[PDB]
Design a binder for these strands. Structure first.
Lengths: 59, 59, 59, 59, 59, 59
RNA sequence: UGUCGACGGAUAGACACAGCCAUCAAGGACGAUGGUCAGGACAUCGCAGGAAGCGAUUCAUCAGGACGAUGA
Protein backbone atom coordinates (compact mmCIF):
# COMPACT_ATOMS: atom_id res chain seq x y z
CA UNK A 1 0.00 0.00 0.00
CA UNK A 2 1.04 3.56 -0.87
CA UNK A 3 -0.93 6.09 1.23
CA UNK A 4 -1.18 9.79 0.28
CA UNK A 5 -3.08 12.79 1.59
CA UNK A 6 -4.58 15.04 -1.12
CA UNK A 7 -7.09 17.91 -1.10
CA UNK A 8 -10.42 18.03 -2.94
CA UNK A 9 -10.02 18.93 -6.63
CA UNK A 10 -6.62 17.16 -6.91
CA UNK A 11 -5.49 14.23 -9.09
CA UNK A 12 -3.59 10.93 -8.80
CA UNK A 13 -2.30 8.31 -11.29
CA UNK A 14 -1.96 4.51 -11.55
CA UNK A 15 0.10 2.59 -14.13
CA UNK A 16 0.34 4.57 -17.39
CA UNK A 17 -3.35 4.29 -18.40
CA UNK A 18 -5.33 5.07 -15.21
CA UNK A 19 -6.13 8.45 -13.62
CA UNK A 20 -7.94 9.29 -10.36
CA UNK A 21 -9.51 12.63 -9.36
CA UNK A 22 -10.87 13.54 -5.92
CA UNK A 23 -13.97 15.46 -7.02
CA UNK A 24 -14.92 16.50 -3.48
CA UNK A 25 -16.40 15.58 -0.09
CA UNK A 26 -19.98 15.51 1.22
CA UNK A 27 -19.66 15.04 4.98
CA UNK A 28 -18.04 11.62 5.49
CA UNK A 29 -18.68 10.75 1.84
CA UNK A 30 -15.83 11.29 -0.62
CA UNK A 31 -16.74 11.68 -4.31
CA UNK A 32 -13.99 10.10 -6.42
CA UNK A 33 -13.63 10.01 -10.22
CA UNK A 34 -11.77 7.13 -11.89
CA UNK A 35 -10.61 7.13 -15.52
CA UNK A 36 -9.44 3.85 -17.07
CA UNK A 37 -9.77 1.92 -20.36
CA UNK A 38 -12.57 -0.68 -20.57
CA UNK A 39 -9.66 -3.14 -20.86
CA UNK A 40 -9.71 -2.94 -17.03
CA UNK A 41 -12.53 -2.91 -14.47
CA UNK A 42 -13.44 -0.40 -11.73
CA UNK A 43 -16.09 -0.83 -9.00
CA UNK A 44 -16.84 -0.32 -5.30
CA UNK A 45 -15.56 -3.19 -3.09
CA UNK A 46 -19.18 -4.26 -2.43
CA UNK A 47 -19.69 -4.46 -6.22
CA UNK A 48 -16.30 -5.86 -7.26
CA UNK A 49 -17.25 -9.21 -5.69
CA UNK A 50 -20.04 -9.75 -8.30
CA UNK A 51 -17.78 -9.26 -11.35
CA UNK A 52 -15.30 -11.62 -9.64
CA UNK A 53 -17.80 -14.22 -8.27
CA UNK A 54 -20.15 -14.79 -11.24
CA UNK A 55 -19.03 -11.98 -13.56
CA UNK A 56 -22.36 -10.21 -13.66
CA UNK A 57 -21.22 -7.44 -16.03
CA UNK A 58 -18.32 -8.84 -18.14
CA UNK A 59 -18.03 -5.48 -19.91
CA UNK B 1 -14.80 8.85 -16.03
CA UNK B 2 -16.58 6.45 -13.65
CA UNK B 3 -17.49 8.35 -10.45
CA UNK B 4 -17.92 6.43 -7.19
CA UNK B 5 -18.68 7.78 -3.71
CA UNK B 6 -17.25 6.18 -0.55
CA UNK B 7 -17.78 6.83 3.15
CA UNK B 8 -14.57 7.08 5.21
CA UNK B 9 -12.99 3.63 5.69
CA UNK B 10 -14.80 2.13 2.65
CA UNK B 11 -13.11 0.63 -0.43
CA UNK B 12 -12.94 0.51 -4.26
CA UNK B 13 -11.22 -1.87 -6.72
CA UNK B 14 -9.50 -1.53 -10.12
CA UNK B 15 -8.72 -4.41 -12.51
CA UNK B 16 -8.18 -7.74 -10.73
CA UNK B 17 -4.94 -6.58 -9.05
CA UNK B 18 -5.59 -3.15 -7.46
CA UNK B 19 -7.50 -2.12 -4.31
CA UNK B 20 -8.21 1.46 -3.17
CA UNK B 21 -9.31 2.60 0.32
CA UNK B 22 -10.48 6.03 1.44
CA UNK B 23 -8.90 6.11 4.90
CA UNK B 24 -10.42 9.39 6.09
CA UNK B 25 -10.76 13.18 5.77
CA UNK B 26 -8.99 16.01 7.61
CA UNK B 27 -10.51 19.36 6.63
CA UNK B 28 -10.48 19.42 2.81
CA UNK B 29 -7.71 16.78 2.72
CA UNK B 30 -8.39 13.08 2.17
CA UNK B 31 -6.04 10.29 3.27
CA UNK B 32 -6.25 7.73 0.44
CA UNK B 33 -4.60 4.27 0.34
CA UNK B 34 -3.55 2.60 -2.94
CA UNK B 35 -2.74 -1.13 -3.02
CA UNK B 36 -1.22 -2.27 -6.34
CA UNK B 37 1.68 -4.57 -7.34
CA UNK B 38 5.07 -2.93 -8.05
CA UNK B 39 4.38 -4.18 -11.60
CA UNK B 40 2.51 -0.85 -11.92
CA UNK B 41 3.51 2.65 -10.77
CA UNK B 42 1.42 4.90 -8.51
CA UNK B 43 1.95 8.67 -8.11
CA UNK B 44 0.09 11.92 -7.44
CA UNK B 45 -0.34 14.09 -10.55
CA UNK B 46 2.44 16.53 -9.54
CA UNK B 47 4.93 13.61 -9.38
CA UNK B 48 3.42 11.66 -12.32
CA UNK B 49 4.66 14.38 -14.70
CA UNK B 50 8.27 13.36 -13.88
CA UNK B 51 7.59 9.77 -14.99
CA UNK B 52 6.43 11.41 -18.25
CA UNK B 53 9.55 13.64 -18.35
CA UNK B 54 11.83 10.62 -18.93
CA UNK B 55 14.29 8.98 -16.52
CA UNK B 56 17.35 6.70 -16.38
CA UNK B 57 19.09 4.25 -13.99
CA UNK B 58 16.25 3.03 -11.71
CA UNK B 59 16.56 1.86 -8.09
CA UNK C 1 -48.82 42.45 6.34
CA UNK C 2 -46.67 44.69 8.60
CA UNK C 3 -42.90 44.04 8.38
CA UNK C 4 -40.43 45.24 11.04
CA UNK C 5 -36.66 44.82 11.51
CA UNK C 6 -35.94 44.07 15.18
CA UNK C 7 -32.47 43.68 16.73
CA UNK C 8 -31.44 41.30 19.53
CA UNK C 9 -32.81 42.45 22.91
CA UNK C 10 -35.67 44.59 21.50
CA UNK C 11 -39.44 43.98 21.53
CA UNK C 12 -42.70 44.10 19.52
CA UNK C 13 -46.20 44.72 20.94
CA UNK C 14 -49.48 43.28 19.59
CA UNK C 15 -53.02 44.28 20.62
CA UNK C 16 -52.98 45.49 24.25
CA UNK C 17 -52.04 42.19 25.95
CA UNK C 18 -49.31 40.49 23.84
CA UNK C 19 -45.59 41.36 23.71
CA UNK C 20 -42.76 39.66 21.76
CA UNK C 21 -39.01 39.71 22.54
CA UNK C 22 -36.04 38.68 20.38
CA UNK C 23 -33.99 37.06 23.16
CA UNK C 24 -31.16 36.52 20.66
CA UNK C 25 -29.89 35.01 17.39
CA UNK C 26 -27.86 31.93 16.42
CA UNK C 27 -26.91 32.26 12.73
CA UNK C 28 -29.76 31.03 10.50
CA UNK C 29 -32.00 30.43 13.54
CA UNK C 30 -33.57 32.95 15.93
CA UNK C 31 -34.53 32.70 19.63
CA UNK C 32 -37.86 34.49 20.14
CA UNK C 33 -39.94 34.74 23.33
CA UNK C 34 -43.70 35.41 23.35
CA UNK C 35 -45.34 37.18 26.32
CA UNK C 36 -49.05 36.48 25.92
CA UNK C 37 -51.57 35.55 28.65
CA UNK C 38 -52.71 31.91 29.02
CA UNK C 39 -56.14 33.14 27.89
CA UNK C 40 -54.70 33.06 24.33
CA UNK C 41 -52.94 30.14 22.64
CA UNK C 42 -49.47 30.45 21.07
CA UNK C 43 -47.87 27.81 18.81
CA UNK C 44 -45.41 27.22 15.97
CA UNK C 45 -47.04 26.98 12.51
CA UNK C 46 -46.29 23.23 12.29
CA UNK C 47 -47.93 22.93 15.75
CA UNK C 48 -50.85 25.32 15.09
CA UNK C 49 -52.06 23.35 12.08
CA UNK C 50 -51.96 20.10 14.10
CA UNK C 51 -54.32 21.69 16.67
CA UNK C 52 -56.62 23.03 13.93
CA UNK C 53 -56.54 19.69 12.09
CA UNK C 54 -59.70 19.10 14.16
CA UNK C 55 -58.54 17.82 17.57
CA UNK C 56 -60.21 19.95 20.24
CA UNK C 57 -63.70 18.41 20.51
CA UNK C 58 -64.44 16.12 23.49
CA UNK C 59 -64.24 12.33 23.40
CA UNK D 1 -42.55 33.81 28.36
CA UNK D 2 -43.17 31.06 25.77
CA UNK D 3 -39.91 30.58 23.85
CA UNK D 4 -39.22 29.18 20.37
CA UNK D 5 -36.03 28.71 18.35
CA UNK D 6 -37.19 29.53 14.81
CA UNK D 7 -35.26 29.17 11.56
CA UNK D 8 -35.60 31.83 8.87
CA UNK D 9 -38.65 31.13 6.70
CA UNK D 10 -40.64 29.34 9.44
CA UNK D 11 -43.87 30.67 11.00
CA UNK D 12 -45.76 31.07 14.31
CA UNK D 13 -49.37 31.74 15.41
CA UNK D 14 -51.09 33.66 18.24
CA UNK D 15 -54.78 33.35 19.18
CA UNK D 16 -56.99 32.92 16.09
CA UNK D 17 -56.35 36.32 14.41
CA UNK D 18 -52.54 36.68 14.43
CA UNK D 19 -49.79 34.98 12.42
CA UNK D 20 -46.03 35.69 12.49
CA UNK D 21 -43.27 34.84 9.98
CA UNK D 22 -39.50 35.18 10.51
CA UNK D 23 -38.65 36.49 7.03
CA UNK D 24 -34.93 36.35 7.82
CA UNK D 25 -31.99 37.87 9.68
CA UNK D 26 -29.71 40.69 8.54
CA UNK D 27 -26.76 40.22 10.89
CA UNK D 28 -27.97 40.84 14.46
CA UNK D 29 -31.12 42.39 13.00
CA UNK D 30 -34.22 40.27 12.45
CA UNK D 31 -36.77 40.87 9.65
CA UNK D 32 -40.22 39.84 10.93
CA UNK D 33 -43.59 39.80 9.14
CA UNK D 34 -46.69 40.40 11.27
CA UNK D 35 -50.05 39.23 9.99
CA UNK D 36 -52.89 40.44 12.19
CA UNK D 37 -56.05 42.32 11.23
CA UNK D 38 -55.80 46.13 11.37
CA UNK D 39 -58.34 45.60 14.15
CA UNK D 40 -55.29 45.16 16.44
CA UNK D 41 -52.48 47.66 16.92
CA UNK D 42 -49.03 46.37 16.02
CA UNK D 43 -45.81 48.34 16.73
CA UNK D 44 -42.41 48.04 18.41
CA UNK D 45 -42.29 48.85 22.15
CA UNK D 46 -40.76 52.28 21.38
CA UNK D 47 -43.94 53.24 19.51
CA UNK D 48 -46.42 51.40 21.71
CA UNK D 49 -45.22 53.49 24.68
CA UNK D 50 -46.48 56.73 23.04
CA UNK D 51 -49.72 55.13 21.83
CA UNK D 52 -50.47 54.04 25.41
CA UNK D 53 -49.63 57.61 26.48
CA UNK D 54 -53.17 58.44 25.26
CA UNK D 55 -53.36 58.48 21.44
CA UNK D 56 -52.88 56.74 18.08
CA UNK D 57 -50.40 57.28 15.19
CA UNK D 58 -49.93 61.08 15.20
CA UNK D 59 -50.64 63.72 12.55
CA UNK E 1 1.27 36.33 39.52
CA UNK E 2 -0.34 32.86 39.64
CA UNK E 3 0.88 29.79 37.71
CA UNK E 4 -1.48 26.77 37.59
CA UNK E 5 -2.15 23.64 35.50
CA UNK E 6 -5.67 22.71 34.33
CA UNK E 7 -6.91 19.98 31.96
CA UNK E 8 -9.50 20.22 29.19
CA UNK E 9 -13.07 20.98 30.31
CA UNK E 10 -11.94 22.62 33.59
CA UNK E 11 -12.43 26.25 34.69
CA UNK E 12 -10.55 29.22 36.20
CA UNK E 13 -11.67 32.63 37.55
CA UNK E 14 -10.53 36.26 37.83
CA UNK E 15 -11.99 39.14 39.90
CA UNK E 16 -15.67 38.68 40.79
CA UNK E 17 -17.00 38.84 37.21
CA UNK E 18 -14.60 36.93 34.90
CA UNK E 19 -14.47 33.21 34.06
CA UNK E 20 -12.01 31.25 31.88
CA UNK E 21 -12.75 27.78 30.47
CA UNK E 22 -10.43 25.44 28.57
CA UNK E 23 -12.63 24.13 25.74
CA UNK E 24 -9.80 21.78 24.68
CA UNK E 25 -6.54 21.23 22.75
CA UNK E 26 -5.33 20.43 19.22
CA UNK E 27 -1.58 19.76 19.35
CA UNK E 28 -0.07 23.01 20.65
CA UNK E 29 -3.24 25.00 19.93
CA UNK E 30 -5.52 25.52 22.92
CA UNK E 31 -9.15 26.61 22.46
CA UNK E 32 -10.17 28.83 25.38
CA UNK E 33 -13.49 30.42 26.36
CA UNK E 34 -13.45 33.82 28.12
CA UNK E 35 -16.52 35.19 29.89
CA UNK E 36 -16.44 38.83 31.05
CA UNK E 37 -18.90 41.75 31.01
CA UNK E 38 -18.79 44.36 28.22
CA UNK E 39 -17.68 46.69 31.05
CA UNK E 40 -14.17 45.30 30.39
CA UNK E 41 -12.14 44.63 27.24
CA UNK E 42 -10.56 41.36 26.06
CA UNK E 43 -8.27 40.58 23.09
CA UNK E 44 -5.07 38.64 22.38
CA UNK E 45 -1.71 40.35 22.98
CA UNK E 46 -1.42 41.25 19.26
CA UNK E 47 -4.69 43.20 19.23
CA UNK E 48 -4.28 44.66 22.75
CA UNK E 49 -1.49 46.92 21.43
CA UNK E 50 -4.17 48.94 19.56
CA UNK E 51 -6.12 49.57 22.79
CA UNK E 52 -2.83 50.86 24.23
CA UNK E 53 -1.42 52.88 21.30
CA UNK E 54 -4.12 53.93 18.78
CA UNK E 55 -7.37 53.29 20.70
CA UNK E 56 -10.97 52.81 19.56
CA UNK E 57 -11.75 56.55 19.39
CA UNK E 58 -9.50 59.42 18.21
CA UNK E 59 -9.11 62.78 19.97
CA UNK F 1 -18.45 35.14 25.77
CA UNK F 2 -15.31 35.06 23.61
CA UNK F 3 -13.58 31.97 22.21
CA UNK F 4 -9.94 32.03 21.06
CA UNK F 5 -7.35 29.52 19.85
CA UNK F 6 -3.93 30.29 21.37
CA UNK F 7 -0.83 28.04 21.13
CA UNK F 8 1.85 27.48 23.74
CA UNK F 9 4.09 30.43 24.66
CA UNK F 10 1.58 33.08 23.47
CA UNK F 11 -0.48 35.64 25.44
CA UNK F 12 -3.98 37.14 25.91
CA UNK F 13 -5.20 40.28 27.74
CA UNK F 14 -8.21 41.37 29.82
CA UNK F 15 -9.24 44.88 30.93
CA UNK F 16 -6.25 47.25 30.93
CA UNK F 17 -4.23 45.56 33.73
CA UNK F 18 -4.64 41.77 33.36
CA UNK F 19 -2.44 39.48 31.24
CA UNK F 20 -2.74 35.73 30.53
CA UNK F 21 -0.01 33.47 29.13
CA UNK F 22 -0.35 29.86 27.97
CA UNK F 23 2.84 28.31 29.37
CA UNK F 24 2.39 24.93 27.64
CA UNK F 25 0.65 21.52 27.52
CA UNK F 26 1.17 18.01 28.92
CA UNK F 27 -1.35 15.66 27.28
CA UNK F 28 -4.71 17.04 28.48
CA UNK F 29 -3.13 19.27 31.15
CA UNK F 30 -2.56 22.92 30.21
CA UNK F 31 -0.10 25.07 32.20
CA UNK F 32 -1.14 28.73 32.45
CA UNK F 33 0.22 31.96 33.96
CA UNK F 34 -1.99 34.84 35.16
CA UNK F 35 -0.87 38.40 35.94
CA UNK F 36 -3.38 40.68 37.70
CA UNK F 37 -3.24 43.62 40.13
CA UNK F 38 -3.67 43.19 43.90
CA UNK F 39 -7.02 44.97 43.38
CA UNK F 40 -8.56 41.70 42.08
CA UNK F 41 -8.58 38.00 43.02
CA UNK F 42 -7.56 34.99 40.90
CA UNK F 43 -8.04 31.25 41.54
CA UNK F 44 -9.28 28.03 39.90
CA UNK F 45 -13.05 27.42 39.84
CA UNK F 46 -12.73 25.07 42.85
CA UNK F 47 -11.31 27.84 45.04
CA UNK F 48 -13.33 30.69 43.48
CA UNK F 49 -16.43 29.30 45.23
CA UNK F 50 -14.91 30.35 48.60
CA UNK F 51 -14.88 34.02 47.48
CA UNK F 52 -18.38 33.85 45.96
CA UNK F 53 -20.41 31.59 48.28
CA UNK F 54 -18.82 31.48 51.77
CA UNK F 55 -16.34 34.40 51.69
CA UNK F 56 -13.01 34.92 53.41
CA UNK F 57 -14.46 37.16 56.15
CA UNK F 58 -17.66 36.59 58.19
CA UNK F 59 -20.46 39.14 58.70
C1' U G 1 -24.80 21.15 4.02
C1' G G 2 -25.47 16.03 5.55
C1' U G 3 -27.31 11.32 3.98
C1' C G 4 -28.38 7.88 0.29
C1' G G 5 -27.81 5.00 -3.88
C1' A G 6 -25.45 3.48 -8.44
C1' C G 7 -21.62 -3.37 -11.52
C1' G G 8 -22.25 3.31 -12.86
C1' G G 9 -17.15 3.96 -17.06
C1' A G 10 -20.98 9.50 -16.18
C1' U G 11 -16.13 15.83 -13.43
C1' A G 12 -21.80 11.49 -12.66
C1' G G 13 -26.73 10.66 -10.18
C1' A G 14 -30.87 10.38 -5.99
C1' C G 15 -32.74 12.14 -1.05
C1' A G 16 -33.43 15.85 2.75
C1' C G 17 -32.20 21.71 2.00
C1' A G 18 -26.18 25.37 3.91
C1' G G 19 -22.87 32.92 4.46
C1' C G 20 -21.72 37.32 7.72
C1' C G 21 -22.67 42.74 9.60
C1' A G 22 -24.38 48.24 10.31
C1' U G 23 -28.09 52.52 9.58
C1' C G 24 -33.10 54.34 8.89
C1' A G 25 -38.41 53.04 9.51
C1' A G 26 -46.24 54.79 14.92
C1' G G 27 -44.36 51.00 9.06
C1' G G 28 -50.01 47.44 8.10
C1' A G 29 -45.07 46.67 2.52
C1' C G 30 -42.63 39.58 2.73
C1' G G 31 -40.58 48.39 4.17
C1' A G 32 -36.09 50.95 2.65
C1' U G 33 -30.30 51.88 2.57
C1' G G 34 -25.09 50.52 2.96
C1' G G 35 -20.92 47.35 4.25
C1' U G 36 -18.36 42.36 4.80
C1' C G 37 -15.23 37.18 8.39
C1' A G 38 -9.57 36.82 14.71
C1' G G 39 -14.21 37.71 18.01
C1' G G 40 -17.47 39.40 22.75
C1' A G 41 -19.78 33.57 19.36
C1' C G 42 -18.32 26.97 22.91
C1' A G 43 -18.93 30.88 15.38
C1' U G 44 -23.43 26.55 13.53
C1' C G 45 -26.94 22.89 13.94
C1' G G 46 -30.72 19.93 16.41
C1' C G 47 -34.90 19.15 20.35
C1' A G 48 -39.18 21.42 22.23
C1' G G 49 -43.17 24.87 25.29
C1' G G 50 -46.19 29.64 28.56
C1' A G 51 -39.46 28.73 30.76
C1' A G 52 -35.68 35.43 28.72
C1' G G 53 -36.28 26.85 28.01
C1' C G 54 -32.67 22.52 26.57
C1' G G 55 -28.41 19.24 23.70
C1' A G 56 -23.95 18.99 20.44
C1' U G 57 -18.13 21.78 17.25
C1' U G 58 -10.88 21.67 14.15
C1' C G 59 -7.42 22.97 10.05
C1' A G 60 -2.93 22.45 7.34
C1' U G 61 2.17 20.99 5.65
C1' C G 62 5.52 17.28 4.21
C1' A G 63 5.43 12.70 1.37
C1' G G 64 6.20 7.10 -0.83
C1' G G 65 4.36 1.19 -2.17
C1' A G 66 3.80 2.38 4.54
C1' C G 67 -4.06 2.10 6.48
C1' G G 68 2.75 7.04 5.63
C1' A G 69 4.72 10.80 8.73
C1' U G 70 4.18 15.66 10.88
C1' G G 71 2.83 20.58 12.02
C1' A G 72 -0.66 24.19 13.65
Amino acid sequence: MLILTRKVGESINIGDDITITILGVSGQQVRIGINAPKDVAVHREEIYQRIQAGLTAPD
